[PDB]
Amino acid sequence: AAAKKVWSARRLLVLLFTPLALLPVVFALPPKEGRCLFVILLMAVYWCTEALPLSVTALLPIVLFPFMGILPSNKVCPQYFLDTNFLFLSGLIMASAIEEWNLHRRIALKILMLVGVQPARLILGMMVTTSFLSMWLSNTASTAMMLPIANAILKSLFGDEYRRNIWKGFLISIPYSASIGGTATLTGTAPNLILLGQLKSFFPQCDVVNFGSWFIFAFPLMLLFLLAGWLWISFLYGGNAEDRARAVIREEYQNLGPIKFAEQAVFILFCMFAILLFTRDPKFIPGWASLFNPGFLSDAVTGVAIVTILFFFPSQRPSLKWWFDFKAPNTETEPLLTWKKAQETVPWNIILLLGGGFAMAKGCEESGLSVWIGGQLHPLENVPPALAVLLITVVIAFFTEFASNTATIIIFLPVLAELAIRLRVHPLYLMIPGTVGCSFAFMLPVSTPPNSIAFASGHLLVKDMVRTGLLMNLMGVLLLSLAMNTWAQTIFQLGTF
Amino acid sequence: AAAKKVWSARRLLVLLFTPLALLPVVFALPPKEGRCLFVILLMAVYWCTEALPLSVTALLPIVLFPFMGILPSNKVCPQYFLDTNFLFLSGLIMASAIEEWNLHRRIALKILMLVGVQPARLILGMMVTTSFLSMWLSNTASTAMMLPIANAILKSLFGDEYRRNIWKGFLISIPYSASIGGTATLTGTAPNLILLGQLKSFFPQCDVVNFGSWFIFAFPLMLLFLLAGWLWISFLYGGNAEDRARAVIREEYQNLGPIKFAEQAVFILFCMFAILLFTRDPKFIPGWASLFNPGFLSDAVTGVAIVTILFFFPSQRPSLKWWFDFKAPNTETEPLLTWKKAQETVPWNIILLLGGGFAMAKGCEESGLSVWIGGQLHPLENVPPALAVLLITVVIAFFTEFASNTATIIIFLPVLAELAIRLRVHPLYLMIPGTVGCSFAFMLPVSTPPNSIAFASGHLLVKDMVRTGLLMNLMGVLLLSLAMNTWAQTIFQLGTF
Ligand SMILES: CC(C)CCC[C@@H](C)[C@H]1CC[C@H]2[C@@H]3CC=C4C[C@@H](O)CC[C@]4(C)[C@H]3CC[C@]12C
Ligand SMILES: CC(C)CCC[C@@H](C)[C@H]1CC[C@H]2[C@@H]3CC=C4C[C@@H](O)CC[C@]4(C)[C@H]3CC[C@]12C
Ligand SMILES: CC(C)CCC[C@@H](C)[C@H]1CC[C@H]2[C@@H]3CC=C4C[C@@H](O)CC[C@]4(C)[C@H]3CC[C@]12C
Ligand SMILES: CC(C)CCC[C@@H](C)[C@H]1CC[C@H]2[C@@H]3CC=C4C[C@@H](O)CC[C@]4(C)[C@H]3CC[C@]12C
Ligand SMILES: CC(C)CCC[C@@H](C)[C@H]1CC[C@H]2[C@@H]3CC=C4C[C@@H](O)CC[C@]4(C)[C@H]3CC[C@]12C
Ligand SMILES: CC(C)CCC[C@@H](C)[C@H]1CC[C@H]2[C@@H]3CC=C4C[C@@H](O)CC[C@]4(C)[C@H]3CC[C@]12C
Ligand SMILES: CC(C)CCC[C@@H](C)[C@H]1CC[C@H]2[C@@H]3CC=C4C[C@@H](O)CC[C@]4(C)[C@H]3CC[C@]12C
Ligand SMILES: CC(C)CCC[C@@H](C)[C@H]1CC[C@H]2[C@@H]3CC=C4C[C@@H](O)CC[C@]4(C)[C@H]3CC[C@]12C
Ligand SMILES: CC(C)CCC[C@@H](C)[C@H]1CC[C@H]2[C@@H]3CC=C4C[C@@H](O)CC[C@]4(C)[C@H]3CC[C@]12C
Ligand SMILES: CC(C)CCC[C@@H](C)[C@H]1CC[C@H]2[C@@H]3CC=C4C[C@@H](O)CC[C@]4(C)[C@H]3CC[C@]12C
Ligand SMILES: CC(C)CCC[C@@H](C)[C@H]1CC[C@H]2[C@@H]3CC=C4C[C@@H](O)CC[C@]4(C)[C@H]3CC[C@]12C
Ligand SMILES: CC(C)CCC[C@@H](C)[C@H]1CC[C@H]2[C@@H]3CC=C4C[C@@H](O)CC[C@]4(C)[C@H]3CC[C@]12C
Ligand SMILES: CCCCCCCCCCCCCC
Ligand SMILES: CCCCCCCCCCCCCC
Ligand SMILES: CCCCCCCCCCCCCC
Ligand SMILES: CCCCCCCCCCCCCC
Ligand SMILES: CCCCCCCCCCCCCC
Ligand SMILES: CCCCCCCCCCCCCC
Ligand code: NA
Ligand code: NA
């Protein structure tokens, strides 16, 4: 009867009744901690229910922290453009340049010719390809470059319900596989570097964690959880015609024609971007960042420097004969990427969302909410450490679904640092589960910017990724427990304290 | 002969030959100061020559400051989203909402009916109206709301060279008049508040400057320089037909129809935005910011809070009968502004440009370049103070043309604070000329975000605003000298030290 009427006004009802519902939180715990917790929970609920646009919800700290006395306006505001947001923006512009010169179509056609016209084969091929792309680039970047290729693939092989279910699954596989791929390498995603820096600050003595040890630990996790995710996606979606389809694919590749100068320039800039990101500061061999002041350089500088080249590099072959040829027309050359096209194709909503995550994080530590959470976990000492770390990674994997991976790892890592020493257990035994599990962002679009990129297409529903990410998070937590129980205690020698 | 060939490749030639030309600067003065000066001059040249897009040039500090050892990456990047950038973004979104509901057309038609079909009358009317709008709102905001009205006006009265010259002049009058209007009131523009805060920090004893004194000092400057600018624009541009034109104007107003609920809601949100901005913290009567922690609240919080309402407020009249009427269709209501339309219509290039200004400013003080500049001005002591302040405001008015007003005022105000004490003159006699003259941004689009908004239309040329802003800056400097010589020495009692 009235259920349809209530469900029609879902937005305003949630907006007006969420602060009222979360009001007892403020009175439950100390004032600043209570107000910060109220802000965090309000932001999470508004993100999950889509009561406000993700960007608008991300701007909530600017209003809430100063009014509640948590952070000044001059402190919460600069958090929205930390250097990580520049790296993500530079990756987005690089992906925009890749799309704009039809390089994604060439890559997609190459993938179809290599793999074939089989939805399961194509899904798995992009799973491994995007994970490989994510071991060196950020998850948001790799997702922003792999949705163009995936959409080209779909428009290729498909030119009823099976098609559109394949659409849903074929597009859900990319952000998930990017989040999977970010975990194995320290350079793969920001939370790994956050873990390393926080370990250096908290524990100068502990130096067993490097690129090699982290890679040998987490690559099996990549393989296992990637296969598990691929099987889940395949089962949920998809369970002389082949010769004709391959003939059409080859005809389309020939219709693409020879590679243009702009495509080669964009691809070479991509290769330089990835190589400079990886070689900036490896932890086994020093990088080129050692040639300058320590701590002055980051991945944001590399990204911005690479992107700057796209805005003045010519898109056509420059010939010295033009200067001598007075008969040649005097027209300005087209750059690789104009700012107009970039501004049209850059998702600034994602930038604002990441900024909201950073701001809510800084509010969390500054208000003392993180210290309060660490203090509240004190009675978790009689509980055996194994399933204690199990429930810790469960709650971390289920809280990273609201904020970004970077925000949740910054919020929770010092809490785990205090908790591990307080419970006389090995710190890494709690350091690593949180860092890996924060990348398990699968429920909502706001969980990670890759998911927002996925719904940028419009073929994915919230309920679908909710249903998939439930079991994705479950298997991720189970494999984290397996890693902590079998081969983490020897690689990082964390089995003895 | 080859002049056309060289002028064809203006972009790359400037890009490659500007660092080479500015190379001796690094060796001329101490290393960090030299590198910072090189960055500032390179950014200014690239902005003036359009060698790179304004946003791309604004991103130069992220690459240059960390590589040159001036600022760390974690200290340059957050400068791009200081709270000044949220206030401007909120104003841009508010202007977008005003445009999206055709309120600008209603205001424009009202202006034509009040004024008449006369280009000089309309130009002057918008001069005073935009100056009035700028006494309480930021220059960028008021410009972003007044270009829509101006474009509606042009499409109204005009439906050969005289038309298009009127186009140029009619569109140049808005950003200029906004920059004029920002100076008279402390709340008018950010540099006035920067002056007040820097005066409080440097000179706690000096408290003669308040809202009333600044207003009575600078309102005559508004009137004089506004009339001078209006005469210059009129002379440069523009030097029973009237009844029929007025009949068409009235017919268009009737075609607009009755004001919709969305238009009234947007206008009321505008009024609340302006009132809350003005009453947040007046310096003669305390505002509502005194109800909270001191220094926690700013104009950014007010702007974001007001803009947040636009994204969930319904655009249609909500009736309680809908709940009882079970036969009514159950469709979601349209909000006042969706995030998609805002993201389409927000000029993020302006946000990046302002961030580049903030970053280059912080690089300027951190590297010691500001202290070096202050030390170099030591031999300017035998020169009489009058024409010394004249040349000081000349160089300030001619340097604010490259960076934003906020960036240049932050860069130069501490330098003037040291210089005034070093030359045993009244500090305000140097405080005020710099603050007012930094708002004299008239040469280039990068001089102030209002100018970028002006070229957002595309009917303005660089040479035209260069030609106009030359004399605009000249008259502004002359009137600053007049104010410093006649009625500043009594209002601020700065004639005796
Ligand atoms: C927003 C909707 C969708 C989810 C539910 C949120 C609200 C109703 C829930 C979430 C967690 C809840 C709190 C959990 C624990 C406590 C401590 C107790 O001593 C008093 C009640 C209090 C403070 C609860 C109040 C209600 C609460 C804030
Ligand atoms: C996880 C699901 C069930 C609920 C949604 C998450 C939020 C709203 C829940 C999860 C656990 C909850 C907390 C559990 C226990 C306490 C201690 C009590 O003295 C005050 C409330 C407080 C601090 C709760 C606040 C609300 C809380 C943070
Ligand atoms: C083996 C015979 C039949 C075919 C030849 C192999 C071809 C199709 C394979 C071999 C190596 C492959 C490349 C390996 C890695 C990458 C990087 C990835 O980001 C996009 C796809 C791309 C660029 C692949 C395209 C297809 C490729 C070029
Ligand atoms: C191929 C394109 C993308 C350019 C990148 C080339 C890479 C491989 C180059 C460029 C700069 C180089 C670094 C420059 C300086 C040093 C310091 C030295 O004590 C050890 C080697 C090391 C750390 C180099 C390693 C290789 C390096 C990172
Ligand atoms: C590096 C030294 C030589 C100075 C800089 C020379 C630059 C400005 C010159 C060298 C070669 C030139 C290119 C040669 C040929 C063409 C094709 C024609 O449609 C004009 C643009 C374009 C694309 C020229 C742009 C300018 C250019 C790139
Ligand atoms: C919302 C963000 C900032 C943090 C995530 C939710 C936090 C506040 C929740 C998640 C799980 C919660 C804990 C769950 C169970 C217990 C056991 C008992 O002693 C009550 C408090 C305590 C220790 C809770 C404290 C609050 C807690 C840590
Ligand atoms: C970029 C173009 C358009 C404008 C001109 C910029 C270059 C050529 C100019 C601007 C200011 C100049 C500097 C001004 C003063 C000095 C100090 C002197 O002891 C050595 C030369 C040196 C260091 C000049 C070198 C050339 C210079 C850097
Ligand atoms: C204003 C026009 C003429 C030039 C463009 C502005 C820049 C490039 C000019 C204006 C004034 C110039 C400065 C004037 C005097 C000196 C002192 C000398 O020991 C080193 C160079 C230095 C520090 C110059 C550097 C370049 C400079 C800052
Ligand atoms: C005097 C007779 C002939 C006509 C009636 C006067 C009308 C046309 C005038 C009187 C006051 C005027 C308003 C005064 C101030 C503003 C705010 C400005 O931001 C937009 C125009 C607007 C909204 C004006 C519109 C025209 C207006 C309503
Ligand atoms: C009309 C719409 C836009 C709402 C704004 C109303 C304005 C005029 C109201 C709202 C909040 C008010 C302030 C609330 C509290 C105080 C502190 C008191 O010691 C002096 C008055 C002062 C400073 C009020 C001044 C008037 C004020 C600023
Ligand atoms: C404040 C209390 C009453 C709870 C919140 C009630 C809100 C959700 C209700 C009250 C009146 C309602 C509006 C009444 C009429 C219409 C027209 C119809 O096309 C549905 C949408 C719309 C625009 C409704 C949207 C939801 C609404 C604004
Ligand atoms: C580029 C930004 C950061 C600053 C603006 C330009 C600065 C560097 C320029 C503008 C005018 C210049 C001054 C002009 C004249 C003199 C007199 C003599 O003693 C040489 C140095 C000195 C004192 C110059 C120092 C540098 C200076 C202050
Ligand atoms: C004085 C009371 C403090 C605790 C309650 C604060 C409630 C703030 C609600 C903000 C809602 C913003 C979105 C509409
Ligand atoms: C104890 C000092 C602060 C008291 C008020 C805290 C809550 C303020 C909420 C402001 C909400 C503004 C929404 C636009
Ligand atoms: C035979 C190979 C021809 C290659 C042509 C394209 C070269 C593109 C180079 C881009 C370099 C970008 C960084 C300077
Ligand atoms: C070691 C030399 C330091 C001084 C010169 C630095 C030159 C930097 C040029 C950067 C140009 C960026 C736009 C192409
Ligand atoms: C004295 C330590 C720094 C030496 C080098 C200074 C100049 C660096 C320029 C880097 C330019 C990078 C362009 C992409
Ligand atoms: C008779 C007057 C009718 C007015 C209808 C429109 C009212 C709009 C109110 C907007 C309020 C925005 C802040 C809550
Ligand atoms: Na997350
Ligand atoms: Na300026």
Swiss-Prot record, chains A, B:
Its main location: membrane. It comes from the Eukaryota. Optimum pH is 7.5. It is a multi-pass membrane protein. The gene is SLC13A3. Expression is highest in kidney. Detected in placenta, brain, liver and pancreas. High-affinity sodium-dicarboxylate cotransporter that accepts a range of substrates with 4-6 carbon atoms, such as the citric acid cycle intermediates succinate and alpha-ketoglutarate (2-oxoglutarate), as well as other compounds including N-acetyl-L-aspartate. Transports the dicarboxylate into the cell with a probable stoichiometry of 3 Na(+) for 1 divalent dicarboxylate, rendering the process electrogenic. Can transport citrate in a Na(+)-dependent manner, recognizing the divalent form of citrate rather than the trivalent form which is normally found in blood. Keywords: Cell membrane, Disease variant, Glycoprotein, Ion transport, Lipid transport, Membrane, Sodium, Sodium transport, Symport, Transmembrane, Transmembrane helix, Transport. Li(+) decreases succinate transport in the presence of Na(+). Residues 1-11, 72-77, 315-343, 365-382, 448-467 are cytoplasmic. This is Na(+)/dicarboxylate cotransporter 3. One of its GO terms (cellular component) is extracellular exosome.
